[PDB]
Amino acid sequence: SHMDSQNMTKAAQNLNSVQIAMTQTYRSLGNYPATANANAATQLANGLVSLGKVSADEAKNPFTGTAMGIFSFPRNSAANKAFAITVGGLTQAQCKTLVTSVGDMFPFINVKEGAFAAVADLGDFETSVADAATGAGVIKSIAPGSANLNLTNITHVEKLCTGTAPFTVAFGNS
């Protein structure tokens, strides 16, 4: 199956390693490192590698061969209280497979067309209401009233990652 492909297996392992490193490092500080743009996000990812908090292979997006980006964003209006690992360059098929294969490790999921260029593009970890029925934008979050991705809902399954490739999925935690 696609979920067991070399790249999908690596993307699951990498996302896990990176999110664990992020929470282990900053859940003690209360705040995540500010990342103004895509460049700052890919520098943060490379920083985890240089400091030995994850291997070089673990920070890589297996679909692009470059570093996944790590954006710090707001939670309940408070700046940098959450972070999101961005996996871009995804075809629609890779987006559907990746989201459903690693989605359960993340409370926040935002599917976008194109890369996240600014913190504003991510929304808010706690106040952005999910609507998986649209298969786009925030499709999973802790927000009262959010309609999170549910695989038993055929609408959620068909609409997932609808649109134009490449897609970038932001997997967030706090």
From Swiss-Prot:
It is found in: Fimbrium; Membrane. Changing residue 95 to S: Loss of autoagglutination and pili. Disulfide bonds join 95-161. It is a single-pass membrane protein. The leader sequence region and some other sequence particularities suggest that TcpA may represent a novel class of pilin, and imply the existence of a novel signal peptidase. Major component of the toxin co-regulated pilus (tcp) which is a type IV pilus essential for bacterial aggregation and subsequent colonization in the host small intestine. This is Toxin coregulated pilin. It comes from Vibrio cholerae serotype O1 (strain ATCC 39315 / El Tor Inaba N16961).
